[PDB]
């Protein structure tokens, strides 16, 4: 049947079936198997098209949205490989002062965050991580902690 937002796909490189979630942009080999509030951390990479292209990391953010997506993709690879963990990359690289809390946003309900961020967060299971999620703020990786 599959939980909210999951579809079956075929790997372009290997032909093996995998699963993709169009709400969270998550993808995984394994077959996948609502609350008032969720708790999430995030790692935001901002770009020249961000509504406010500035962070505690740098006053003027100049990277292209394409460059921002490559950075996000690289961080996701490191997190999934276990070379680095989410908290460590969030502390170092998130373009939001929540970096100082290892990316933790705290708990929130529907109606509080931008819709793509909200929809991804509510469709993650506890412990699950999103793929790249685009909002007006920039591109996010979202980790649902509660």
């Amino acid at each position: 049947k599959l939980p909210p937002g999951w579809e079956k796909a075929m790997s372009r490189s290997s032909g093996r079936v995998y699963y993709f979630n169009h709400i969270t942009n998550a993808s995984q080999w394994e077959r996948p198997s609502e609350p008032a509030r969720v708790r999430c951390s995030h790692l935001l990479v901002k770009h020249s098209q961000s509504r406010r292209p500035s962070s505690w990391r740098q006053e003027k953010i100049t990277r292209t949205k394409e460059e921002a997506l490559e950075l996000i993709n690289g961080y996701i690879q490191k997190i999934k490989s276990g070379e680095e963990d989410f908290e460590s990359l969030a502390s170092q690289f998130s373009d939001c002062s929540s970096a100082k809390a290892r990316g933790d946003l705290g708990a929130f309900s529907r109606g509080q965050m931008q819709k793509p961020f909200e929809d991804a967060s509510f469709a993650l299971r506890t412990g699950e991580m999103s793929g790249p999620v685009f909002t007006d703020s920039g591109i996010h990786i979202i980790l649902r902690t509660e």
Binding site: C96, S97, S98, L105, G106, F108, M113, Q114, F117, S137
Partner: peptide, 6 residues
């Protein structure tokens, strides 16, 4: 806790 998202 800093204006644009919590």
């Amino acid at each position: 806790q800093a204006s644009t998202p919590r």
